[PDB]
Design a protein around this ligand. Structure first.
Ligand SMILES: COc1ccc(OC)c(Nc2ncnc(Nc3ccccc3S(=O)(=O)C(C)C)n2)c1
Ligand SMILES: COc1ccc(OC)c(Nc2ncnc(Nc3ccccc3S(=O)(=O)C(C)C)n2)c1
Ligand SMILES: N[C@@H](CCCC[NH3+])C(=O)O
Ligand SMILES: N[C@@H](CCCC[NH3+])C(=O)O
Lengths: 489, 484
C-alpha cells in the first residue's frame, strides 16, 4: 500500500535478477504476432479449442494478475489497445527453462513480457495464449494508478503514458486526432494543394494579432519571433505561382492558457488562387460535413458543451450552415445603429455606451476593433449551438489583410465558423492591392511581394485542436494535446 | 531601364486606372480550366485548327510580350509550372468591351490576367488561347528579372517564377516527405505531435533556443529532438510512433546545418539494431527508385564546376565499426575506457600529428567524433554506408552492445560524407542511464519501456542529395538569412 516501498522492493528485485544471471532487460525478443493480429486470427476458435502445435512469439503488458492455485496462473495481456488472456498451465510449461512457480511468482502488474506459447480458447470461451515460457522484457517498477486516480487529477497530463495505458478512451481520442489530420491532408491533396514548410522563426510576427514568443539566434546575434500564423509566407508562395498551397504545423501566441487556448497550437492554413469568399464557404461546408461523416457515419454528433455532468447537445453538420453579418447583427441585437467609419469618435463612444449599459467588460485599450470583437463575442458568437455557423463581412478595421467587400462599404469578404460559441476557422478573400495594404507605409518582405502581383486569392485557417475537441467530446484543449505545457510542480 | 522609375510609372498607372473607374484588382474571375488542363485537352489539336464553338475562361501570369503590327499581339502565359501562348487578334476581339489596342498596350511582363477566349494552334503549331477579352487581375509593379545571387533566398517567389528548376526542387521535397509518411503509415506507424517547447532540451547534444513563456512566467527551450517524448509514448503503449516536424539547435549556419531543420523520428517497440538497418536500406532504396526509376543517381559532390559522382542506393550498404576502423586507418589502438588519460592523449596526438583541428573541450566523445570525421566518414562516396557500434560515451541513450564491451548498437548512415540518419537500440534499463540516478523521461522508464529501436532522419539533407544541391538553403523555401 506504500508506493515508495513498492518501488524500492521492485528495484532490489531487478538487481537480484541480474546477479542471478537473468537479464531483466534483454536486447531482442523476436515477436511473431501482435495482439490485434492474434485476436483477428483466432477469435473464431471454438470453445475449449487449442492449437497446441502452433507455437507463437507474442509480447504485451501484464495488466491483471491472479491465480487458481500454485499450478495455474491467469493474466491479462494488453498491446495496441487490445487484450487477451494469458493462461499459464503447469503441464504446458517448458520445465527445462526454470521452475514454473518461480517464473510466474515474479510477474507484477505492468510488466512487459515476451511469451512463447500456443493459441486457444478456455472452456469458458476466453481467447488466450498458453505459454511454454514467459520472459520479463521490461519491468514496471511503480504501482499503476486506478482509473479513479486519473479522473480529477493532473496525472493524465504530466504522465500521459499512464492515461494511454489505463484509459481506453484516451487512445481513441488521440487516434481520432490523427485521423482528422490525415483526412484534412488527403482532402487538400486530392484537390491539387501542395504542402510546404515555412519558417518557424522570423524577424516579424504577422498574420494575426497576438503577443509573440521571442528567442535569441546565436549565430545571427539577433532576436527572432516565433510565428503567430503562417499567413504571410504562404501568400508569398502564391505570388511565386504555387496556386494551391498549405501548411499544417505549430504556431505560437504568447498569451494566457484556458480551456480553448494553448500558447502553442496546431494550425492548417491554405491559400487558393482565383478563389474568393464564396468558394471558401463552400469548401468549409464540404470539408466539415465530409469529415464528420467520415468519422461517424452521420452528420449529427453529440457534444457535452457544459461538461460530462450535464446533458449533451446535438450538433448537426448537415450543410448549408447559417451566415450572420457581424455589424447588421450587432446593430439588431443592441438596437443601435453603428455608422461608418467604425473608428470615428462618435461610433467609438456608441460602442462603449453599449458595453457600459450592458455591463460587458470594456477592452483595454478601447479601440474600435477591440470593441467590435467584444460586442460580437457577447451578442452573436452563441447565436447557434445546434449547428456550426459563419459570422461574415467583418469591418475592414478588424481585418487588415482581408479584401474590401465588393458591395458593402467599410466591410471585408471574411468569414469565421463557430461551433458551440468557439471559433474554429477564419477565412477571407485576400487583400491583394498593395496600395490598400495600409501598413505597407507587418513585413517589408510581404509588402514587396504584393507589388509583384498577388492573384485574386482566398485563404483559410483551421484550428485543428479545437476541431478535435468537438469531434472527441472534450471540453478542454489539454485533453487533445498529448503533452500540454503544464506548470512545473 | 530603371527599376525605381518603372515601379513609379506602374503605380501611377494603377491610380490612373482607378480614377477612370476600372478596378485593376477585381475580386473574382471564374476560371473554366487550368493551364495544365488546357495543354492536356488541346495538345492533340492539329496545326491551325481552332475550336471557336468552345469559349473558355483561363488565368495565368504573362511572362513575355510582343506584337506583329498593331493588329496582332502575342504573349507567354504561365501557370502551375506550364505555359501556353496567347494570340490576341483584332478579328476575334470583343470591341463592345473596350478598345483592342488600348486593352493590350497596357499589359506588362508579370501581369496576372484573366482571358475569355477559344483554344487553337497557330499555323506554326503553337498551342494558344485566342482571347475575345483580356482583363487585368493583378499587375506586377516591378520589373521581373530574367537571370539573377541571394535574391533566390530573400525573394523566393521570384526564384519560383523565373527558374523552373527551383519549382522542381521543392516539388521533390514534398514528394520525399509524402513518401516517408506513406512508408511509415503502411507499416502501422502512428503519427503524433509532441511539444516544440519544454523545460529541458534532450535527445541530442546542441545549444538551445530559449524563449520566455508569459503565462507560466518561465524560460522554456525549443526542442533539439523529439526523442524523449516519443519514447514516453512507447511506454504508453503506442508501439509504433513517429513525428515529422521542426527541431532547433542554436549553433552556426553552414551548407549542411540550419538552426531550424526538419526531422522525422520513429520509435518501433520490439525492433532492434538489425531491424533498423533493414528499414534504412528498404526506405532509401525504395525512395530513390520511386523518384528516379533507378537506384543510381548522379550528384555533384564538389559542385557544378566539377565532375559528378554516381551514388548507388542498391542494398545492402556497407557497415563500418567506428572504433575498429579508426584504429585500422590510424594504425593505433584506443584502449578502453576511451576517457582514460592515456587514450585521450593518444587521440589528441593523432589529431595533432595530422594537423587536424583540436576540439574544445578535448573531450573523449568529441575527439572520437573528430577522428571519425577525418578518417572514416568519406570511406565511401560510391554508395551510402553505415558507421556502427559507437562507444557508450558517445551514445548515452543507446543500449549497450550485446557482445562488444563499451560499445552500443548504434548506426549512422552517411551519403558523401554527410550524416542523414542516426538510429539505435534504445537504452531501457533505468538503472543503466547514469543521468537518471529529464526527470519526466527518467520516471517514464521506471514504468517499463519495452525493448525498442528508434531512428531519426535529416529530411533537408536527404532532399539536397536527391535534388543535386550542395547547400541546405537550396531545399528550404525561406532559409533564415542575415538581415540588412
Ligand atoms: C489570439 O489568438 C490566440 C491567442 C492566444 C492563444 O493561446 C494562448 C491562442 N491559442 C489557440 N489554441 C488553440 N486554438 C486556437 N484557435 C483560435 C483562437 C482565437 C481565434 C481563432 C482561433 S481558430 O481555431 O479559429 C484558428 C484560426 C487559429 N487558439 C490563440
Ligand atoms: C549537432 O546537430 C546540429 C547542430 C547545429 C545545427 O544547425 C545550426 C544543426 N542543423 C542541421 N540541419 C540540417 N540537418 C542536420 N542533420 C544532422 C547534423 C548533424 C548530425 C546528424 C544530422 S542528421 O541529418 O543525420 C539527423 C539525425 C538530424 N542538422 C544540427
Ligand atoms: N492567419 C489567420 C488564418 C488565415 C486567414 C486568411 N488569410 C488566423 O490565424 O486566424
Ligand atoms: N534524436 C536523434 C535521432 C534518434 C536517435 C535514436 N533514438 C538525433 O537527433 O540524432
Amino acid at each position: 500500500v506504500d508506493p515508495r516501498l513498492y518501488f524500492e522492493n521492485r528495484s532490489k528485485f531487478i538487481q537480484d535478477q541480474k546477479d542471478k544471471g537473468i537479464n531483466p532487460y534483454p536486447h531482442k525478443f523476436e515477436r511473431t504476432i501482435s495482439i490485434p493480429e492474434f485476436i483477428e486470427k483466432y477469435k473464431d476458435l471454438g470453445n475449449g479449442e487449442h492449437l497446441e502445435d502452433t507455437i507463437l512469439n507474442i509480447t504485451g503488458r501484464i495488466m491483471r494478475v491472479s491465480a487458481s492455485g500454485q499450478k495455474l496462473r491467469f493474466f491479462d495481456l494488453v498491446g495496441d489497445g487490445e487484450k487477451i488472456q494469458v493462461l499459464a498451465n503447469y503441464s504446458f510449461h517448458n520445465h527445462e527453462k526454470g521452475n514454473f512457480a518461480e517464473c510466474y511468482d515474479k510477474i507484477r502488474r505492468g510488466d512487459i513480457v515476451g511469451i512463447v506459447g500456443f493459441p486457444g480458447k478456455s472452456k469458458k470461451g476466453e481467447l488466450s495464449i498458453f505459454p511454454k515460457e514467459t520472459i520479463l522484457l521490461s519491468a514496471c517498477l511503480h504501482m499503476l494508478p486506478m482509473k479513479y486516480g486519473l479522473k480529477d487529477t493532473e496525472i493524465r497530463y504530466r504522465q500521459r503514458y499512464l492515461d494511454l495505458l489505463i484509459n481506453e478512451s484516451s487512445r481513441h481520442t488521440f487516434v481520432t486526432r490523427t485521423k482528422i489530420i490525415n483526412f484534412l491532408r488527403n482532402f487538400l491533396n486530392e484537390r491539387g494543394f501542395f504542402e510546404v514548410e515555412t519558417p518557424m522563426m522570423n524577424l516579424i510576427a504577422g498574420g494575426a494579432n497576438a503577443r509573440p514568443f521571442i528567442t535569441h539566434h546565436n549565430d545571427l546575434d539577433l532576436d527572432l519571433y516565433l510565428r503567430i500564423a503562417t499567413e504571410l509566407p504562404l501568400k508569398m508562395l502564391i505570388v511565386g505561382g504555387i496556386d494551391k498551397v498549405y501548411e499544417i504545423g505549430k504556431v505560437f501566441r504568447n498569451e494566457g492558457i484556458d480551456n480553448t487556448h494553448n500558447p502553442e497550437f496546431t494550425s492548417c492554413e491554405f491559400y487558393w488562387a482565383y478563389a474568393d469568399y464564396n468558394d471558401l464557404i463552400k469548401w468549409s461546408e464540404d470539408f466539415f460535413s465530409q469529415l464528420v461523416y467520415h468519422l461517424f457515419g452521420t452528420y449529427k454528433i453529440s457534444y457535452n458543451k457544459d461538461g460530462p455532468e450535464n446533458q449533451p447537445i446535438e450538433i448537426d453538420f448537415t450543410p448549408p450552415y447559417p451566415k450572420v453579418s457581424i455589424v447588421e447583427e450587432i446593430e439588431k441585437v443592441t438596437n443601435t445603429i453603428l455608422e461608418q467609419p467604425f473608428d470615428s469618435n462618435e461610433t467609438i463612444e456608441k460602442m462603449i455606451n453599449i458595453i457600459k449599459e450592458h455591463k460587458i467588460e470594456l477592452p483595454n485599450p478601447p479601440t474600435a476593433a477591440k470593441l467590435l470583437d467584444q460586442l460580437a463575442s457577447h451578442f452573436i458568437e452563441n447565436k447557434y449551438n445546434d449547428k456550426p455557423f459563419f459570422i461574415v463581412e467583418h469591418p475592414q478595421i478588424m481585418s487588415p489583410l482581408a479584401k474590401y467587400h465588393r458591395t458593402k462599404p467599410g466591410l471585408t469578404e471574411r468569414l469565421e465558423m463557430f461551433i458551440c460559441g468557439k471559433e474554429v476557422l477564419n477565412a477571407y478573400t485576400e487583400l491583394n492591392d498593395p496600395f490598400k495594404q495600409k501598413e505597407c507605409f507587418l513585413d517589408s518582405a510581404f509588402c514587396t511581394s504584393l507589388e509583384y502581383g498577388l492573384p485574386p486569392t482566398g485563404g483559410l485557417g483551421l484550428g485543428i485542436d479545437r476541431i478535435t475537441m468537438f469531434l472527441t467530446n472534450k471540453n478542454s484543449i489539454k485533453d487533445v494535446i498529448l503533452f500540454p505545457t503544464m506548470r512545473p510542480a
